[PDB]
Amino acid sequence: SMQDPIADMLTRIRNGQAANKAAVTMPSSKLKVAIANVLKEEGFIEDFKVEGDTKPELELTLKYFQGKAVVESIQRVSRPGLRIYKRKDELPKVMAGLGIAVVSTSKGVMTDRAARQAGLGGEIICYVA
Template sequence: MANHDPISDMLTRIRNASEKKHQNTKIPASRMSHSIAKVLQKEGFIADISEEGEGITKHLVLELKYSGKHRHPIIRSMQRVSRPGLRIYKKTRGLPKILGGLGVAIVSTSKGVMSDRDARKQGVGGEVLCYVY
């Protein structure tokens, strides 16, 4: 069965890789997955993003981050919020604060994909893609 939700596929790949303490994980490249990865990197959840392959076989390689000598994953939870069957949109004021601001909601706005913090700063709302903490 073909996956109709590339974003939840991406989140699952990152979640699985960090649970198994992999150094990095590969996800199929797309503009949306690249934007989400950029937000995760800016917010300090992943260390690095690189591209691999050409055309249809292009992949993003995300380098995951861990803390301490026991390598606890920085990403403790990733939840898909808006999905193809049920889109969730929020206005600027309605944007959720994840764990009192410790986590981040990734929002797709008219000004691009950004964290809930940046969306509030720019005064834009949009589709709440996922929560990460």
């Protein structure tokens, strides 16, 4: 009954990239707009924006290189039935480090590579390699 909105966000990106949709709209949230900024600064999406005041609408324009998606895989690792937290030294490297893992640290959400050089770990959200 919509108990994970974060996995609903990655599912819309996954199904949108599979269906060759040019853009994906979803109900916005403070956490969704945070991890969408991680994908935009890392190059998986383009040009996310929030339209609305009381019921805001997160809208992401997906990315294609040739006739293929950019996110080949976007998994959700800490689902609400099983939360996963990692220390600094066992933060995962996804697809040998050429695909990022969004980790929620106490200094905001960032990639795993950003969290290692910042020196702290946290709840890992998704493997968006």
